[PDB]
Amino acid sequence: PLIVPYNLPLPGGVVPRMLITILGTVKPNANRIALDFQRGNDVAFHFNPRFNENNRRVIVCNTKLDNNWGREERQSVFPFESGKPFKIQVLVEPDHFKVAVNDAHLLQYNHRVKKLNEISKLGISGDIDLTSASYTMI
């Protein structure tokens, strides 16, 4: 597979029509998963499934600028399960990242970072076995 945390370079950053695909399997008794689309030290798009925040599962999304987290966007629809294989597709659209899991639409996250072509790395971390991570222009 791939060693986690995993760094996927995004050459020339991202752009609308760019589709990023992350394939792996949630570990048993998972606590968290994170995708971090970074512009240098900033995090343009943080996508963070939490398996046990006050005994609830929640996906937390956010942006980090100059080392400071902004306002969280939270989604209680939670398609992940401990022990099960997943696919995350992040499609960059003009105004938002569009995220589907296992071919079902999950959430959109509006662009806060405007310089899309400088979002040049994806960090993939957490309680997963990572099989593959890649991108394609659609």
Ligand X SMILES: NC(=O)[C@@H]1O[C@H](CO)[C@H](O)[C@H](O)[C@@H]1S[C@@H]1O[C@H](CO)[C@H](O)[C@H](O)[C@H]1O
- Which residues in 75-114 contact Mg ion (CB under 5 A)? 113-114
Q: Does 74 bind ligand X (CB under 6 A)?
A: no
The answer on whether 118 is annotated among ligand-binding residues is: no
**Considering CB distances under 5 to 8 angstroms, the limit depending on partner class, which of Mg ion, ligand X, none binds residue 114?**
Mg ion
Cis peptide leading into residue 5 (ω within 30°): yes
17 binds Mg ion (CB under 5 A): no
Torsions phi, psi for 61 (to 5 deg): -120, 150
- The radius of gyration of the chain's CA atoms, rounded to the nearest angstrom, is 14
* Tokens linked to 40: 């240098």
Which residue reads 């990023």 in tokens? 20
Task: Identify the residue among 5, 69, 102, 105 touching ligand X (CB under 6 A).
Answer: 69
Q: Contact positions toward ligand X, by CB under 6 A?
A: 46, 48, 60, 62, 69, 72
